[PDB]
């Protein structure tokens, strides 16, 4: 058998895989930055890896447009000559394959971020609806702020064994919250204190609030903030440009309505129309508009 | 008898109830955050509650459009099947009904914020005029900045008995203004010092100035600032998008005028028109424009 | 005799009076804030007051449009029934009239700020040219930042005799630049240090940089910053809205050119036009455009 | 012989000279600010000066439009009466000519910044392509942020021998990174620490983050920040205005597509079209669009 790409199943499956890609975009960068050295997130990662493998089987058994193509040989060769390479690299279980340092093995799971390409392929499904693209834009904003928080903690953490002698942002965090790093390397803030501070700093830099209790102090932290300021400015010209445009697109019925109403009102003023005829004109405009949009 | 919904009375009553909803939106969040443990604001709340009850009686005795409907039975059943439930929940005097802790009784008056729905219903009256919608947008800005100041003080205050050991924003405020909290819990800033600082911080976060004498230090304060940065960015794409668009709408006569004037001027340049004919052309344009707009 | 309102004299005089209004808008707020307790600015103020009196005589002897009116009686009665009241209040020499405290006498010269109305009247002359309105918008920005610097110093200075006990912004300035206020009230920063810091703070608040070495600390300073954040946000929706629109208006020839060029290029692509005919099409487009704009 | 100005050689040479102008715009301001008192950048400057001299020879031997002109006498006299003066001032090797203080000799090489005029002349080549003008706009942003970093270090450095007594930004930098200036003038930060901090401050001021670990403290630093706030605001109204407009221009196919699709969808809703005819309408729209754009 074979699946039609416009069926109610394949429509729901493509919206379900968007939510599993959003899960991968959150918990893969987090695990690679904060957790290096079954549990619920270890079995949920296994379930989600199994669903991204089931999606390869669905991609071998779904129709496509050349007019629709429905023969399994003409489907399978199209997927092989298309995206199958990226989909298999995003699905090889390197962590279960390898037996070689656990730092590299935990970092190598960042290959799962190729699952973001499954959202870039399918944008013709997701972008069609105004409330869906406005959701995607705010999740692109929150995911970029999260990925930058993982890089900012990777920088701030690597400068402790490559020791800066109390200069970088983690030593300042320890002193500010009353959880100082001891001279032996003991103590210091928790993973919640470090993550919530790293995410607070990257929203503060991207939205340009710059609150000044977290501030970049070593050269790698200053060079990172120059990059976040070049990202955040292009990203405000693009994301919040598009969000304000989509808000105006949803508002376009109201914008057209008031523009034609103001023309009718200014016409009624300019000709000084008597009340019985004025009411007939402005009531007819409201009927004609509320009928045809 | 019965009231016509377009009458000069019902027009003025709907603008008066907007001002009583703006009073509820200010003094209910303030009393629930800053004042928990007749006076003028106790009797003014009683007068305003009585007017929001009188408005339920007016809503039972006003006509509506199906063509207008004027029979009191067809009015009353329409209000019951419509908004009467929300209007009665917004008008039950819980504080006068109950006899059971005074913290809960003072918090339960936040049900009065359902009166904001009386403004959302009637937007077809209020949004029709450019100076009125520009006022509403600046009051939505100032009321969101005020509601966030009440949440920010609720957070900063709750972390003192759930004691942070001198980390949160109220201990920093006490040290900055020369009114420190003593080790016994005595002293500290006044309600004016705490409110004006909380409102200053939420305008500073929403407008993105981030002045850095008030800055979020505990995890609940940092998680609150991440929310205020996600609000403030969507809200600049929406409120100050609409305010700049309404300013351009009020300016649209001037924008059209200069666009048609520049076309006439560039035409007069391109054909190199002699002075007597040039004056006749550019004076006729000013007459035709100042006549028809 | 009588002056034609479109003459080369009256055109140059109205541009000269704009520069004397910009001088009044700078040096009147500055003198009222920073200098209270001949010199070049004392004689230049006398020369400029004499020119704003000569302008009243020109306003009695210039034609106006009802068709032009040229009889001196029909001119003089029109100026009396129009703006003469504001022009005389802006020209009464109160400082030379009075003989009663010198604080009030120096403050009373702020009546000269009614000369800003001479710019608001004549906007039909000034707003006609794109480079002139873009200059006016940047001078409205710099003059609002300057007037707010004069209010910010008036607040910060009045809280020293109404003594805050070392809390307000002037005590912090003295400590930061190494010019502390002594306990006797001696020492402290110069008028250059206080003015340049006050103007730096109001550009930092209006443009929303918020650098955090000057920050508002008393309640009057925090309430002032809430006002500067409500001004600066409406003012970015209006001034830098209009500056970006005027930049796009000056760019409109280039925007039209590339829009029609891209249509011609996409047409040439879609029909796959052969090179000799393609060159004839795209050269003809450049000739037709460079001829007619 | 003579070169056609539209030839594949002259097209590639004008794109190569853009990259050598971007090199001059980086390393000339840097050398004049940071390095005053063969190496790779000394021989690369010699190679690049030789290529800007070869470009004068190409400018004497290239055709131009009056219809094209191809006689070497009518070319050479046009270049002499045009830009040859600026091109020779940008190419006189003052550093190799002179033998008189090395401070002045190193500063005098800033005449090479006249090579930026070779980009301003040729904008009809570079501005034609959307990805090229979006690159130019981000390089104008990064080059203005770099030139301001060179001025900011020139100010901060000149106030050390014109000694401020520990007030300016370089003394604060030395104390913040754990590399203090000693009382003898010994020690202090490296050229990497000073450059990366100066560039971090000017991106922080232009993008308006204002992080508050670097902040202007002397009057020349405050007057510089008032200028960077007047630049950064005009520059956001212009550069990020144009970048957001070019992003919308690249998006214009998608914006047109969804606007016509939404009209077709709302028409199909309003007439309640049966499924077989609906599919024929919305498939025909996709064919017609994907054919003609």
UniProtKB/Swiss-Prot annotation, chains A, B, C, D:
It comes from the Eukaryota. Changing residue 280 to P: In LQT2; uncertain significance. Residues 61-81, 126-131 are cytoplasmic. Glycans are attached at residue 182. Changing residue 29 to H: In LQT2; uncertain significance. Changing residue 189 to L: In LQT2; uncertain significance. Changing residue 149 to T: In LQT2; uncertain significance. Changing residue 64 to C: In LQT2; uncertain significance. Changing residue 205 to R: In LQT2; uncertain significance. It is found in: Cell membrane. Changing residue 150 to S: In LQT2; uncertain significance. A motif (Selectivity filter) lies at residues 208-213. Changing residue 132 to V: Perturbs steady-state activation. Accelerates the activation rate at the most depolarised potentials. Affects modestly the activation rate at less positive voltages. Changing residue 241 to R: In LQT2; uncertain significance. Changing residue 180 to L: In LQT2; uncertain significance. Phosphorylated on serine and threonine residues. Phosphorylation by PKA inhibits ion conduction. Changing residue 232 to S: In LQT2; uncertain significance. The chain crosses the membrane at residues 7-27, 40-60, 82-100, 105-125, 132-152, 223-243. Changing residue 166 to L: In LQT2; uncertain significance. Changing residue 152 to R: In LQT2; uncertain significance. The potassium channel is probably composed of a homo- or heterotetrameric complex of pore-forming alpha subunits that can associate with modulating beta subunits. Interacts with DNAJB12 and DNAJB14; chaperones DNAJB12 and DNAJB14 promote tetramerization. Heteromultimer with KCNH6/ERG2 and KCNH7/ERG3. Interacts with ALG10B. Forms a stable complex with KCNE1 or KCNE2, and that this heteromultimerization regulates inward rectifier potassium channel activity. Interacts with CANX. The core-glycosylated, but not the fully glycosylated form interacts with RNF207. Belongs to the potassium channel family. H (Eag) (TC 1.A.1.20) subfamily. Kv11.1/KCNH2 sub-subfamily. The S4-S5 linker acts as a signal integrator where it both couples voltage-sensor domain (VSD) movement to pore opening and closure, as well as providing a binding site for other domains that regulate activation and/or deactivation of the channel. This is Voltage-gated inwardly rectifying potassium channel KCNH2. It comes from Homo sapiens.
